[PDB]
Every structure is written in C-alpha cells, then in structure tokens.
Design an enzyme around this catalytic site. Structure first.
Site, mmCIF file in Angstrom:
data_model
loop_
_atom_site.group_PDB
_atom_site.id
_atom_site.type_symbol
_atom_site.label_atom_id
_atom_site.label_comp_id
_atom_site.label_asym_id
_atom_site.label_seq_id
_atom_site.Cartn_x
_atom_site.Cartn_y
_atom_site.Cartn_z
ATOM 1 N N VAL A 114 -1.122 -1.297 -4.384
ATOM 2 C CA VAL A 114 -0.488 -1.490 -5.834
ATOM 3 C C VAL A 114 -0.542 -2.848 -6.089
ATOM 4 O O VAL A 114 0.119 -3.723 -5.116
ATOM 5 C CB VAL A 114 0.645 -0.564 -5.632
ATOM 6 C CG1 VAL A 114 1.232 -0.823 -7.174
ATOM 7 C CG2 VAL A 114 0.682 0.684 -5.315
ATOM 8 N N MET A 169 8.598 -3.143 -11.597
ATOM 9 C CA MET A 169 10.092 -3.177 -11.212
ATOM 10 C C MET A 169 10.337 -4.204 -10.107
ATOM 11 O O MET A 169 9.939 -4.108 -9.020
ATOM 12 C CB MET A 169 10.410 -1.716 -10.741
ATOM 13 C CG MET A 169 10.346 -0.737 -11.706
ATOM 14 S SD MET A 169 11.655 -0.969 -13.054
ATOM 15 C CE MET A 169 12.922 0.080 -11.879
ATOM 16 N N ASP A 200 9.241 15.600 -6.142
ATOM 17 C CA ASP A 200 9.197 14.988 -4.970
ATOM 18 C C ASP A 200 10.368 13.980 -5.063
ATOM 19 O O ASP A 200 10.223 12.659 -4.832
ATOM 20 C CB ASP A 200 7.965 14.405 -4.532
ATOM 21 C CG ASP A 200 7.990 13.748 -2.956
ATOM 22 O OD1 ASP A 200 8.627 13.736 -2.261
ATOM 23 O OD2 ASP A 200 6.935 13.023 -2.898
ATOM 24 N N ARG A 231 12.592 7.036 -1.840
ATOM 25 C CA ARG A 231 11.358 6.203 -1.631
ATOM 26 C C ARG A 231 10.414 6.242 -3.121
ATOM 27 O O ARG A 231 9.665 5.425 -3.336
ATOM 28 C CB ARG A 231 10.668 6.920 -0.591
ATOM 29 C CG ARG A 231 10.122 8.109 -0.844
ATOM 30 C CD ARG A 231 9.219 8.822 0.222
ATOM 31 N NE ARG A 231 9.015 10.241 0.091
ATOM 32 C CZ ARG A 231 9.995 11.229 0.325
ATOM 33 N NH1 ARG A 231 11.267 10.878 1.080
ATOM 34 N NH2 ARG A 231 9.920 12.595 0.140
ATOM 35 N N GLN A 290 0.346 5.613 -0.855
ATOM 36 C CA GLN A 290 -0.425 6.703 -0.238
ATOM 37 C C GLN A 290 -1.569 7.251 -1.109
ATOM 38 O O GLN A 290 -2.487 7.651 -0.496
ATOM 39 C CB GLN A 290 0.239 8.330 -0.143
ATOM 40 C CG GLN A 290 0.648 8.906 -1.698
ATOM 41 C CD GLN A 290 1.145 10.244 -1.241
ATOM 42 O OE1 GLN A 290 2.365 10.727 -1.741
ATOM 43 N NE2 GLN A 290 0.111 11.100 -0.540
ATOM 44 N N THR A 329 0.839 -1.067 -0.021
ATOM 45 C CA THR A 329 -0.012 -0.162 0.039
ATOM 46 C C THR A 329 0.903 1.374 -0.003
ATOM 47 O O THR A 329 1.944 1.196 0.717
ATOM 48 C CB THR A 329 -1.046 0.100 1.180
ATOM 49 O OG1 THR A 329 -1.866 -1.047 0.836
ATOM 50 C CG2 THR A 329 -1.472 1.404 1.529
ATOM 51 N N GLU A 371 5.196 0.548 -15.830
ATOM 52 C CA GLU A 371 6.274 -0.542 -15.671
ATOM 53 C C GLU A 371 6.473 -1.167 -14.433
ATOM 54 O O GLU A 371 6.237 -0.406 -13.413
ATOM 55 C CB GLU A 371 7.514 0.385 -16.316
ATOM 56 C CG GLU A 371 8.665 -0.470 -16.257
ATOM 57 C CD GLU A 371 10.092 0.263 -16.734
ATOM 58 O OE1 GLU A 371 9.879 1.428 -17.165
ATOM 59 O OE2 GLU A 371 11.124 -0.463 -16.962
HETATM 60 C C1 LIG Z 1 9.060 -8.911 -0.249
HETATM 61 N N1 LIG Z 1 9.204 -7.747 0.638
HETATM 62 C C2 LIG Z 1 10.381 -7.430 1.289
HETATM 63 C C3 LIG Z 1 9.004 -6.298 -0.201
HETATM 64 C C4 LIG Z 1 7.852 -6.072 -0.430
HETATM 65 O O1 LIG Z 1 6.901 -7.138 -0.858
HETATM 66 C C5 LIG Z 1 7.653 -4.555 -1.522
HETATM 67 O O2 LIG Z 1 7.847 -5.299 -2.551
HETATM 68 C C6 LIG Z 1 7.519 -4.544 -3.940
HETATM 69 C C7 LIG Z 1 7.328 -3.199 -3.986
HETATM 70 C C8 LIG Z 1 6.870 -2.647 -5.350
HETATM 71 C C9 LIG Z 1 7.660 -3.412 -6.510
HETATM 72 N N2 LIG Z 1 7.550 -2.818 -7.683
HETATM 73 C C10 LIG Z 1 6.754 -1.829 -8.469
HETATM 74 N N3 LIG Z 1 7.082 -1.739 -9.680
HETATM 75 C C11 LIG Z 1 6.104 -0.758 -10.449
HETATM 76 C C12 LIG Z 1 5.668 0.283 -9.428
HETATM 77 N N4 LIG Z 1 4.721 1.398 -10.079
HETATM 78 C C13 LIG Z 1 4.095 2.175 -9.200
HETATM 79 O O3 LIG Z 1 3.258 2.921 -9.727
HETATM 80 C C14 LIG Z 1 4.141 1.964 -7.713
HETATM 81 O O4 LIG Z 1 3.438 2.719 -7.012
HETATM 82 N N5 LIG Z 1 4.830 0.887 -7.251
HETATM 83 C C15 LIG Z 1 4.930 0.937 -5.702
HETATM 84 C C16 LIG Z 1 5.994 1.676 -5.309
HETATM 85 C C17 LIG Z 1 6.297 1.594 -3.876
HETATM 86 C C18 LIG Z 1 5.428 0.721 -3.089
HETATM 87 C C19 LIG Z 1 4.719 -0.336 -3.800
HETATM 88 C C20 LIG Z 1 4.234 0.035 -5.000
HETATM 89 C C21 LIG Z 1 4.166 -1.031 -2.804
HETATM 90 C C22 LIG Z 1 4.274 -0.441 -1.294
HETATM 91 C C23 LIG Z 1 5.716 0.259 -1.402
HETATM 92 C C24 LIG Z 1 5.510 0.195 -8.024
HETATM 93 N N6 LIG Z 1 6.240 -1.021 -7.624
HETATM 94 C C25 LIG Z 1 8.144 -4.647 -6.286
HETATM 95 C C26 LIG Z 1 7.972 -5.409 -4.928
#
Ligand SMILES: CN(C)C[C@H](O)COc1ccc(Nc2ncc3[nH]c(=O)c(=O)n(-c4ccc5c(c4)CCC5)c3n2)cc1
Length: 271
Positions: free
Chosen positions: A28, A89, A133, A137, A24, A22, A87
């Site tokens: 996701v 990541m 920003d 993060r 803000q 999650t 995309e």
């Molecule tokens: C296993 N454990 C230790 C890690 C957690 O399981 C977090 O794993 C993660 C988080 C993001 C990704 N990848 C990704 N890829 C494209 C994004 N595009 C967006 O617009 C966008 O908003 N997030 C996102 C950005 C930040 C955050 C989230 C989503 C979720 C909370 C923090 C995108 N996150 C992979 C793995």
C-alpha cells in the site's frame, strides 16, 4: 475521461510518494491524484482477491459516504496488479496508534475513538451493509486524530482460505460471537459483537483480546458463556456498554443506534 467509468481511476493520474507497508493483498502506497489530492493506493497481489466480484461491489462501496468511513475513491482495473484508491489517513492503523504509549491518552480521547467508530457503524447499519471484519486493525487515524472505519465488507473477496472460515488459521476468532464460531451465522449482531471487542481493544491500549489464550481456547471460553473483562481504563458505564455487545442471544444485543446513544450519554456524564 474516455475509457473510464465513474468507479474507475486512470492510474496515469497517480503520483507515488511513499510506501506505507504491506497488507494481506500486498503493498500500500501514499500518493497524489492529479497532483493535488492525497490518496492511498492498495496494490492488489495477483491471486489474492476475487477481482471481478470486488469491482462490482466497488460501485456500491463508493456510495457509502460518511465522515467516519474511509472513502473508496475508485479502482484501477485495466491491468494487473489492480489498484484500490482510498482516502489517505496520515496517522496509520488504530491498533499501532493505541500501542504508542507516548500519546498518554485521556479516557475522554478513548471514548471519542469509540464514538467515531460507532457513528461509521450506525451509518453502515442504516444502509444494511455489514462490515464482516470489524477490529482495531481495520480502523485508521487521520492527522486530526479522528478514527475511521476501513475495508468494510472486503473479507468477502479474500481468496486465502486461511482467512475465510473457522477451519482457516487467520479467521477473526477473537472478534466473533458464538453463533459465528458454531454455525457461521453472520448478521448485524455479529458486527455488534465485534464492536464490543473493538471498544475493549481501545480501552486496553491495543492488547490482543484473550491475550493468554489460543484461538481454540477463546472459542471454548466464549461457548462456555465467559467473556473479556474490564480494562483498567474503562469506567463502570463504559464496561457496561462493551459488555452489552456480548449477550449470548444475538437478538438481546443492542443496535448501533442504541450504542451511539449510550456512548453520547457517557460522554455527557464523564465530561
Ligand atoms: C512510521 N511507522 C511507525 C508507521 C508505519 O509506516 C505504518 O504507517 C502507515 C500506515 C497506513 C497509513 N495510512 C493509510 N491510509 C489509507 C489506507 N487505505 C487502505 O486501503 C489501506 O490499506 N491502508 C493501510 C492499512 C494498514 C496498513 C497499511 C496500509 C500498510 C501496512 C498496514 C491505508 N493506510 C499511514 C501510515
């Protein structure tokens, strides 16, 4: 197809596979588009976003295509919650990645992360597009360990007043130059300042900037002309680069093109 503009994705084309977390704007997810292509799906919580303004800006954002920028693929806006499709990541947010000590990063890997981000920012600067920003993060890491800049310009559409002013309680004080904190003067040079702080975050393996201070104390410190100091992993030359981003006078701070040149020079001298 019929009923969808070039900026619009049909949500029926999405297969949802995992919850990422999650943010803000809410949850996701990770999924596929038309069964084959990896995507991330922001699900935008009702009342969190200026949705009509964002939708118009999405048209501009989709044309910001650079290898080090997390690509906006489109939006699903026929029903609420709306989706933003990006995309994917696989290695998650940069801040969490830096904090995982198992990686045992070499300083050459840390400088490469800085270069990734700097390239994204030089591109946005060339298109006169402010991030507004920039911080670890808001960077993501792919399965090859490449860092990309995400959520560029998105702070403009946040409706939570805690985020959108210094009077607010979630404003990025620790990434802000004195003219933002004093006067709300955003410019290319406020992105430059933030990039310096981001270099500091990378070389500190994800420490909070000014970790022993409150936001109010940080504001006072930087208004007195005082700064972050050198991370243990930063060479003298790396420190000089990040420090150059913090000149009290905004017009004395480098451009992203200059910073990229400086970072490449250090890569050459230190590899
Ligand atoms: C296993 N454990 C230790 C890690 C957690 O399981 C977090 O794993 C993660 C988080 C993001 C990704 N990848 C990704 N890829 C494209 C994004 N595009 C967006 O617009 C966008 O908003 N997030 C996102 C950005 C930040 C955050 C989230 C989503 C979720 C909370 C923090 C995108 N996150 C992979 C793995």
């Amino acid at each position: 197809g019929l009923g969808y503009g070039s900026w619009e994705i049909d949500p029926k084309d999405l297969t949802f596979l995992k919850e990422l977390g999650t943010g803000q704007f809410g949850v996701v997810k990770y999924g596929k588009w038309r069964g084959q292509y990896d995507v991330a799906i922001k699900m935008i919580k009702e009342g969190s976003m200026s949705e009509d303004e964002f939708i118009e800006e999405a048209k501009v954002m989709m044309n910001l295509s650079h290898e080090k920028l997390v690509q906006l693929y489109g939006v699903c806006t026929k029903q609420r919650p709306i989706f933003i499709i990006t995309e994917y990541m696989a290695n998650g947010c940069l801040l969490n990645y830096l904090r995982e000590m198992r990686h045992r990063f070499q300083t050459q890997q840390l400088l490469e992360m800085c270069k990734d981000v700097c390239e994204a920012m030089e591109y946005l600067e060339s298109k006169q597009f402010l991030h507004r920003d920039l911080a670890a993060r808001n960077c993501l890491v792919n399965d090859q360990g490449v860092v990309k800049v995400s959520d560029f310009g998105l702070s403009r559409y946040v409706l939570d007043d805690e985020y959108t002013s210094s009077v607010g309680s979630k404003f990025p004080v620790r990434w802000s130059p004195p003219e933002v904190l004093m006067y709300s003067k955003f410019s290319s040079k406020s992105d430059i300042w933030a990039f310096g702080v981001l270099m500091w975050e990378i070389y500190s393996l994800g420490k909070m900037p000014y970790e022993r201070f409150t936001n109010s104390e940080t504001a006072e410190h930087i208004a007195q002309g005082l700064r972050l100091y050198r991370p243990h992993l930063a060479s003298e030359k790396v420190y000089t680069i990040m420090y150059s981003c913090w000149h009290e006078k905004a017009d004395e701070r480098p451009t992203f093109k200059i910073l990229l040149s400086n970072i490449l020079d250090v890569m050459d001298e230190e590899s």
